Amino acid sequence: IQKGSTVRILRKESYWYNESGTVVVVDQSKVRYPVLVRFTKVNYAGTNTNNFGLNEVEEVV
Amino acid sequence: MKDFLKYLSTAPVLLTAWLTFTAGFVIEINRFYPDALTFPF
Amino acid sequence: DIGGLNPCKDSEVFQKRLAKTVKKLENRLKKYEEGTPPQIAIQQQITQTKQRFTRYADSNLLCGNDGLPHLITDGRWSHGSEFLLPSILFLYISGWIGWVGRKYIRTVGQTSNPTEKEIIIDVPLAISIMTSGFLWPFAAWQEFLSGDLIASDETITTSP
Amino acid sequence: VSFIKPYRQDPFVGHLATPITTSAFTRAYLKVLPAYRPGLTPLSRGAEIGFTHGYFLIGPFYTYGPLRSVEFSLTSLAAGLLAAITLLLILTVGLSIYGQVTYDVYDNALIVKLVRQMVGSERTQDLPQIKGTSELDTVLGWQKFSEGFFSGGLIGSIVAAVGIALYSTYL
Amino acid sequence: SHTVKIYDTCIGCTQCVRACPTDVLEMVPWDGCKAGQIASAPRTEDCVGCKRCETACPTDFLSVRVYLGGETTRSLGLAY
Amino acid sequence: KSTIVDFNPVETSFEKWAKPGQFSRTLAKGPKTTTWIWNLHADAHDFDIQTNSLQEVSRKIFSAHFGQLAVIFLWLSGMHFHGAYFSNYSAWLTNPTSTKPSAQIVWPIVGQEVLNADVGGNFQGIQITSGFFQLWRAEGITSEVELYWTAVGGLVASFLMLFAGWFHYHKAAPKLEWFQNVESMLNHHLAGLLGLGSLSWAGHQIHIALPINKLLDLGVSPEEIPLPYEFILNRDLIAQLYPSFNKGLTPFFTLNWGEYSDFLTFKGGLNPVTGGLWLTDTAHHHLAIAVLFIVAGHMYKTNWFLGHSIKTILEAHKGPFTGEGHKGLYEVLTTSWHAQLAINLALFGSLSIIVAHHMYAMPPYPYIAIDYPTQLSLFTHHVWIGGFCIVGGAAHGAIFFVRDYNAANNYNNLIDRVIRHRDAIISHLNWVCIFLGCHSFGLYVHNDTMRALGRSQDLFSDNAIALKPIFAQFIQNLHTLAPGSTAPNALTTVSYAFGGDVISVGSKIAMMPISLGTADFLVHHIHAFTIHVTVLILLKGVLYSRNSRLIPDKANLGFRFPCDGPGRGGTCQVSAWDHVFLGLFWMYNSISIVIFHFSWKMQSDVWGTVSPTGAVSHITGGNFAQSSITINGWLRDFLWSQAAQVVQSYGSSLSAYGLIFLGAHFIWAFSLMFLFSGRGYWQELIESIVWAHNKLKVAPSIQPRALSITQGRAVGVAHYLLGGIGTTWAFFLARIISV
Amino acid sequence: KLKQSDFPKFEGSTGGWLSAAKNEEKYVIIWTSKDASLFEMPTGGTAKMNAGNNVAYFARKEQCLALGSQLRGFKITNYKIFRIYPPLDITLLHPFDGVFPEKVNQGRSPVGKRDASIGGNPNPASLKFQ
Numbered sequence A: 001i002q003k004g005s006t007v008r009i010l011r012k013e014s015y016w017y018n019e020s021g022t023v024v025v026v027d028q029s030k031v032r033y034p035v036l037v038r039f040t041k042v043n044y045a046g047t048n049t050n051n052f053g054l055n056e057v058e059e060v061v
Numbered sequence B: 001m002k003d004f005l006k007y008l009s010t011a012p013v014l015l016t017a018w019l020t021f022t023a024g025f026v027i028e029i030n031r032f033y034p035d036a037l038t039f040p041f
Numbered sequence C: 001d002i003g004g005l006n007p008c009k010d011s012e013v014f015q016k017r018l019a020k021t022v023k024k025l026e027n028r029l030k031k032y033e034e035g036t037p038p039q040i041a042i043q044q045q046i047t048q049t050k051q052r053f054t055r056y057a058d059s060n061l062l063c064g065n066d067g068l069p070h071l072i073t074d075g076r077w078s079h080g081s082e083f084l085l086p087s088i089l090f091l092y093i094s095g096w097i098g099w100v101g102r103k104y105i106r107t108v109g110q111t112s113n114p115t116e117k118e119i120i121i122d123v124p125l126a127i128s129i130m131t132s133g134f135l136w137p138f139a140a141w142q143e144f145l146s147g148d149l150i151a152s153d154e155t156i157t158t159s160p
Numbered sequence D: 001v002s003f004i005k006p007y008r009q010d011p012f013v014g015h016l017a018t019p020i021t022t023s024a025f026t027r028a029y030l031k032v033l034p035a036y037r038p039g040l041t042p043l044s045r046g047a048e049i050g051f052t053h054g055y056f057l058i059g060p061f062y063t064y065g066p067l068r069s070v071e072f073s074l075t076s077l078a079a080g081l082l083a084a085i086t087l088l089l090i091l092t093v094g095l096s097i098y099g100q101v102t103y104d105v106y107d108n109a110l111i112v113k114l115v116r117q118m119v120g121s122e123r124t125q126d127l128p129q130i131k132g133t134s135e136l137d138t139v140l141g142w143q144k145f146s147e148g149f150f151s152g153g154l155i156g157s158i159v160a161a162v163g164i165a166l167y168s169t170y171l
Numbered sequence E: 001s002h003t004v005k006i007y008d009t010c011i012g013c014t015q016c017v018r019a020c021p022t023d024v025l026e027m028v029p030w031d032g033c034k035a036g037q038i039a040s041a042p043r044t045e046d047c048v049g050c051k052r053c054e055t056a057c058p059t060d061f062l063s064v065r066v067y068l069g070g071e072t073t074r075s076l077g078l079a080y
Numbered sequence F: 001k002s003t004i005v006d007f008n009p010v011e012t013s014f015e016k017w018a019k020p021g022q023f024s025r026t027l028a029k030g031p032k033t034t035t036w037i038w039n040l041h042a043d044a045h046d047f048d049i050q051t052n053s054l055q056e057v058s059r060k061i062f063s064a065h066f067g068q069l070a071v072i073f074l075w076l077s078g079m080h081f082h083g084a085y086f087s088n089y090s091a092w093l094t095n096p097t098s099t100k101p102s103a104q105i106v107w108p109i110v111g112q113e114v115l116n117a118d119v120g121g122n123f124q125g126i127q128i129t130s131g132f133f134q135l136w137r138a139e140g141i142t143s144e145v146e147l148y149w150t151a152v153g154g155l156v157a158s159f160l161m162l163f164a165g166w167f168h169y170h171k172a173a174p175k176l177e178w179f180q181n182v183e184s185m186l187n188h189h190l191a192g193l194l195g196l197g198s199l200s201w202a203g204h205q206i207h208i209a210l211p212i213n214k215l216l217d218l219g220v221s222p223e224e225i226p227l228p229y230e231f232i233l234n235r236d237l238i239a240q241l242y243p244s245f246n247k248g249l250t251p252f253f254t255l256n257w258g259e260y261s262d263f264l265t266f267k268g269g270l271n272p273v274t275g276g277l278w279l280t281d282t283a284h285h286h287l288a289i290a291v292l293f294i295v296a297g298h299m300y301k302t303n304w305f306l307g308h309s310i311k312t313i314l315e316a317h318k319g320p321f322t323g324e325g326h327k328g329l330y331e332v333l334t335t336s337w338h339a340q341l342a343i344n345l346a347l348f349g350s351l352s353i354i355v356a357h358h359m360y361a362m363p364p365y366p367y368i369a370i371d372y373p374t375q376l377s378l379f380t381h382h383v384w385i386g387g388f389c390i391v392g393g394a395a396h397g398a399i400f401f402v403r404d405y406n407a408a409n410n411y412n413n414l415i416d417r418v419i420r421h422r423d424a425i426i427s428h429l430n431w432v433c434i435f436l437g438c439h440s441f442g443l444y445v446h447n448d449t450m451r452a453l454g455r456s457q458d459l460f461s462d463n464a465i466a467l468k469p470i471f472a473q474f475i476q477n478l479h480t481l482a483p484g485s486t487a488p489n490a491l492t493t494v495s496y497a498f499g500g501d502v503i504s505v506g507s508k509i510a511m512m513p514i515s516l517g518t519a520d521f522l523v524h525h526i527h528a529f530t531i532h533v534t535v536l537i538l539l540k541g542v543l544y545s546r547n548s549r550l551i552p553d554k555a556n557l558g559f560r561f562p563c564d565g566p567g568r569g570g571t572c573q574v575s576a577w578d579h580v581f582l583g584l585f586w587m588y589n590s591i592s593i594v595i596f597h598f599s600w601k602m603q604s605d606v607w608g609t610v611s612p613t614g615a616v617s618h619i620t621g622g623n624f625a626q627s628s629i630t631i632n633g634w635l636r637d638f639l640w641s642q643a644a645q646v647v648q649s650y651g652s653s654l655s656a657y658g659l660i661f662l663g664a665h666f667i668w669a670f671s672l673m674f675l676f677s678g679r680g681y682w683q684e685l686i687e688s689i690v691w692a693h694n695k696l697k698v699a700p701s702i703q704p705r706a707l708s709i710t711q712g713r714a715v716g717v718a719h720y721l722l723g724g725i726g727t728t729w730a731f732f733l734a735r736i737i738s739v
Numbered sequence G: 001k002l003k004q005s006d007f008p009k010f011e012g013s014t015g016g017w018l019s020a021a022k023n024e025e026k027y028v029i030i031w032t033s034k035d036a037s038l039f040e041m042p043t044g045g046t047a048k049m050n051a052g053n054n055v056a057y058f059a060r061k062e063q064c065l066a067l068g069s070q071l072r073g074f075k076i077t078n079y080k081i082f083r084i085y086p087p088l089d090i091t092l093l094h095p096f097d098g099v100f101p102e103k104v105n106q107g108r109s110p111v112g113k114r115d116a117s118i119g120g121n122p123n124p125a126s127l128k129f130q
């Protein structure tokens, strides 16, 4: 995955679970949740972006 | 008349116009053929 | 006949109801003068009451012991104009409404600002979609066949 | 001039020095009441409070009870007296249980000094803490207060019944 | 006293700490995020349960979670 | 480049009409959830958060006032047009005591033509309870052409006010200094508006209403009554009815005002022909009011070395108990629109309630006292408006405290000292509310349980333990003795309610001494208790709007917020808005009890018919005195008994009242869904509904969200008020029109 | 006029502490101000600062912290909050390590940190009878 890639959220406790988002940036450092994904639908708190782990996102073909 | 027509395209104005038209043709059907309990055919 | 009911054309209580309503309207008519608009309105009321009662009598309508038309909605085509034909009419109209709404939602859902086009309707596109709903039974059973009617697993689910 | 100032020069207390909280009339009037009158044992305070309370408590029961009489009736007076005495008994029961669950002290104004001087490294709330230094704030003090309230209530109710009978008969 | 837990989804944006009305949360060094900081809850005895901390949380399902528990005069917000 | 106005501040364009939410910084970005739609209407008139300049807020408020006055003028024009075209006003003029006023006819669709009632005068329509016919008769309007011309003038005036609002927002908007001339504004509103309006109305009454109504009462038919302009051009048509116009204005300018006693009287009582106040008394009243208000308008210093400065008056009113006194109040009321709105709305609602009382107490219109539906409707409507306006004044006081209150500018003044001891105020008001409720309501419950136990001599009744309102009876005696003793130039008491003779017009009672007994004592103390509890809720909201022991920084959360959280044991509804919500509920309770008391007392002990020999028979028969002292009595002899007309209205011309009765019950019960439930359940149900929509690819882009907590409360209270008030509306109208 | 010279010029409000902050605990906030600014008390109304040492007593930690948050608007930062038990048992509370909790300071250990997201919490049925 990279910037601009489309991924499916696999985190169950997510307002965008099973949904598709756009990767903003994948951090190359040793952070726990490097993948930053932007969504079109705001969550219940109003935010439309979140940091996800490498195993919590699945790239769409 | 470019933004006025866009204002008329807003949800409230369009809903009011559509519901006014809808109530209008319903009321006029019930005026011209009143007391219709069953299908006319 | 069906359910112990009898046709309203032979229901004495139905004619009693008609006679009582007409008598009340005429008694009301007595307290006004000449061809004044109140008398014209009451006379129109009497005429409409008589026409409605006559139409209900000659309508294959079954009346109970209260002299009121009862609806036979078990499904028989004999009393098909009471429920079945209005049912078909409503199903057509409501399917039209739902189809045009869904088509508009899916059409402006692929534009740059989908949310803007929901409070400020694209009246040209809206008119284009709305008059295309007359084929909603055919369009629905042409999009379901192609798998374009139902989502599969992109739909979101709660934690459990 | 200003007649409202912070209480005892403390602007952070939830209180004010108004012409009612800290007026000379308020001071004297509250210092002549049995609850705060100096030189009274807790039994005496209870006795005076009970006397006054039974005296004014027999009134409403006798006047407006279920057995009233526009004339003087011994049955009405007896009913009012019994109702007042039973209400005093209920109040005494409340006083007794309140004192039972509130205090654990037999001699106050000392234990506070003892634990402020000789240390109080114990389960606290009996050695340390201790709210109030009055003799009414002890197990013994409150027990005698309740006893006095109860006895004085009986005596005052009887006295008020006698006075009511005399007023209704000889006037 | 209530229970406050911090989860490694913390991005160290400090919005929880500066929203706590009773000084329960604080920012401590960390190496699990870009900011190098994570929220901590070392003074939960002062936690009142108002949940302002998690109203300011930007992470998806929160990184600070408040579990209401036993009540205390501090946790009940009793000035009396 | 005028010194009072700014020229062409805002361009007249339709561009912003196509951008909803442009006023708000947060809503301008566009909707993302359905909460945006509701936030759009909740912030439309909150001009404080739309601009950071007091000048812009003031200009918006000024133009909004113009729009509101245009709406009011359009409404009045519609009323006059309906009177002119769809009314039986001409027939009612010739028979006021036997024709029911109707000014709305109903089209014959879906069988709704049954609503056209037999109002009389060869007319069919809905009976009118707004009293416009009596008002028009008091104005001297004797033809429907005059009503048409008044409607045309109302339309022209409405257009003029619309143009004024547009002009003063877009072409010449006044500056802040112009708005802050409170001395000049008070001078003008007191002299020009009030005094000159009273003077102009006195002139109209004297020259038009006095002669026309005198001719009408004399039996002259409206067709042979001269046109109103002829009473001005001809000094002989009015000098025959009032033989004092023959002297002209010479007695006025020669201080010989005694000559004008023909048409400027001081009589009191009611006109025996019409049952209303003497219109000569009304004209004299308006003249005196005009002079008093014109004099009162020359008080404040505006542009000369003459008059008062409100700042100097307030700053001099200090005291030992009040510290700095009124210092800073002038700055508060000249820099905060919310404080002015609070004061004006509270006094305006109180004025509306006072108007409602004085209306039925002293009927000011001809043939309005014998139109019981009109009297009941006017009283109930004005009391409802007063209660709503009072709650609004409390709400805007709380809003001022949250938003526009500056602690530095109010050091040790009255506002500061009130906040400093808010605990004492609220605790003592709590004790008073408990005392009043315990007493009033528990006396009611004691009466109920004594009656249920078969102990009739133990009640708080007149034939039992009696609570005579001696203070009110003393006042009643003082007023009935006033003419000749304390008002020596009066011929009759101000109102026959205080005592006197039974005034009947056409065998129908207009006014009659309202006896006060133990039943009135209990209901008056119920009124006091309900008013005190409403004041408690609203004052607790205002005083604790900024901080408390629970939330020391409640002002940082704003005026409108749902809570601070489930902590502290739970901090629901701590806002100040949530206090205007509960206060709205309690105002509904209080006003409902007030109007119930009025309806039952009037029907039972004032209204009715008078026999030719002088025997008075009332609508219900005096059951108020003995059966209004128990809750079962209120349930049975008032609610159950007088609800008979509403439930039996089906098939009649009052069937609309039964339908509205049922619909208002439905709406009131509907409110309880929002009042009892919470947002989380509805959000989680919307989650499954959204799942279904996504499964069918029909999920809207604007994400559907459940109504916010504050909006849920607002919807609940609005539906509750609408349902309850509509139920009482239908009940009252059907009952008082049937009988 | 007042018990101590460092008290803010407050006229006293019936919203201050009660019998609780005489036998359970009381909170004191101290700060130094350059100007005698007029500020709003967390309990009642308006008080006046001292051009120097200022000391205020409250019944809750939240009240002291609300006052401190208000002080930040006056560019006052050195405010410090203490807890006083029934006797003179003073404990510094708010600037616990001298640095505000919003700024990271070395020497702080994470308290209440779980090395997983919310979804990793154990099922309640496995946490029965412990």
Ligand code: CLA
Pocket: C097, C098, C099, C100, C101, C102, C104, C121, C126, C129, C130, F688, F689, F690, F692, F693, F696, F698
């Ligand atoms: C117009 C598009 C549209 C379509 C195709 C559907 C379709 C559906 N809705 Mg639905 N809904 C809509 C609009 C729509 N809804 C709107 C606007 C609302 C808000 C009031 C709801 C609220 C709603 C609820 C609360 C529920 C559904 C449910 C359902 C499902 C069962 C059918 C039903 O109960 O009808 C429900 C229909 C209504 C309650 C009335 C809808 C209001 C109007 C008629 C629709 C709006 C018309 C729109 C303005 C047209 C504009 C298009 C034009 C610009 C071209 C079905 C998937 C149910 C479900 O999940 O079952 C599986 C359910 O519980 N819907």
Ligand code: CLA
Pocket: F061, F062, F065, F066, F069, F178, F179, F181, F182, F184, F185, F188, F189, F191, F192, F193
């Ligand atoms: C004698 C002079 C005079 C008169 C009669 C009025 C009358 C009024 N003012 Mg006003 N005002 C005046 C002087 C005057 N003012 C001055 C000198 C100032 C500056 C300090 C203001 C500042 C002011 C503000 C800021 C506001 C008012 C408002 C109002 C209205 C209150 C609403 C009401 O009671 O409805 C009664 C309504 C009527 C009786 C309808 C007829 C009234 C018409 C419009 C005559 C108005 C007189 C007008 C000043 C003449 C100017 C004409 C122009 C060509 C120069 C009322 C129309 C409020 C309002 O509603 O705004 C519109 C409002 O917000 N005034």
Ligand code: CLA
Pocket: F041, F042, F043, F044, F045, F046, F047, F345, F388, F389, F390, F391, F392, F393, F395, F399, F559, F560, F577, F580, F581, F584, F718, F722
């Ligand atoms: C002179 C009168 C007046 C004025 C100028 C204002 C002005 C204001 N009020 Mg206010 N208010 C008033 C009277 C007034 N109010 C009264 C009498 C009450 C007591 C109920 C309140 C209670 C109140 C609260 C509780 C709040 C305000 C708020 C506000 C501000 C924003 C208003 C807004 O955007 O609403 C826009 C308009 C609407 C949202 C309309 C809503 C529709 C209403 C609720 C239903 C009406 C139904 C109607 C009767 C028809 C029903 C019939 C049915 C059959 C359909 C604004 C400064 C709010 C604020 O934030 O202030 C800063 C706020 O929180 N006011």
Ligand code: CLA
Pocket: F429, F430, F431, F433, F434, F435, F436, F437, F438, F441, F442, F445, F533, F536, F537, F582, F583, F585, F586
């Ligand atoms: C019938 C229902 C009902 C009743 C009885 C009350 C009663 C009361 N409300 Mg209310 N309230 C109600 C519905 C009701 N409310 C609803 C629906 C709402 C929603 C908006 C509210 C919202 C509300 C607010 C927001 C407030 C109140 C307040 C009050 C109190 C006013 C003080 C008073 O009179 O106390 C006296 C008690 C009574 C009159 C109740 C009856 C007591 C009897 C008659 C006498 C004593 C009986 C005796 C002790 C029985 C002993 C025997 C028993 C042990 C077996 C009172 C307790 C205010 C408050 O807190 O008090 C100051 C206040 O601020 N209420």
Ligand SMILES: CC1=C(C/C=C(\C)CCC[C@H](C)CCC[C@H](C)CCCC(C)C)C(=O)c2ccccc2C1=O
Pocket: F673, F674, F675, F677, F678, F679, F682, F705, F706, F707, F708, F709, F711, F712, F713
């Ligand atoms: C039902 C309900 C909802 C859900 C309600 C919603 C989503 C409102 C939906 C309104 C629709 C979409 C528009 C209104 C449709 C009406 C038919 C229009 C009103 C009728 C006119 C005559 C005015 C909440 O969000 C809520 C929040 C807090 C407490 C209680 C509740 C609550 O009870």
Ligand code: SF4
Pocket: E004, E019, E020, E021, E022, E023, E024, E025, E046, E047, E048, E049, E050, E051, E052, E053, E054, E066, F567
């Ligand atoms: S509840 Fe949330 S906000 Fe309130 S203190 Fe505990 S953590 Fe900080």
Ligand code: SF4
Pocket: E009, E010, E011, E012, E013, E014, E015, E016, E017, E038, E039, E053, E054, E056, E057, E058, E059, E062, E063, E064
């Ligand atoms: S709230 Fe979540 S994100 Fe904001 S700081 Fe505390 S932990 Fe980091």
Ligand code: SF4
Pocket: F562, F563, F564, F565, F566, F570, F571, F572, F573, F678, F709
């Ligand atoms: S949600 Fe309802 S309950 Fe939970 S905090 Fe906000 S208000 Fe109190």
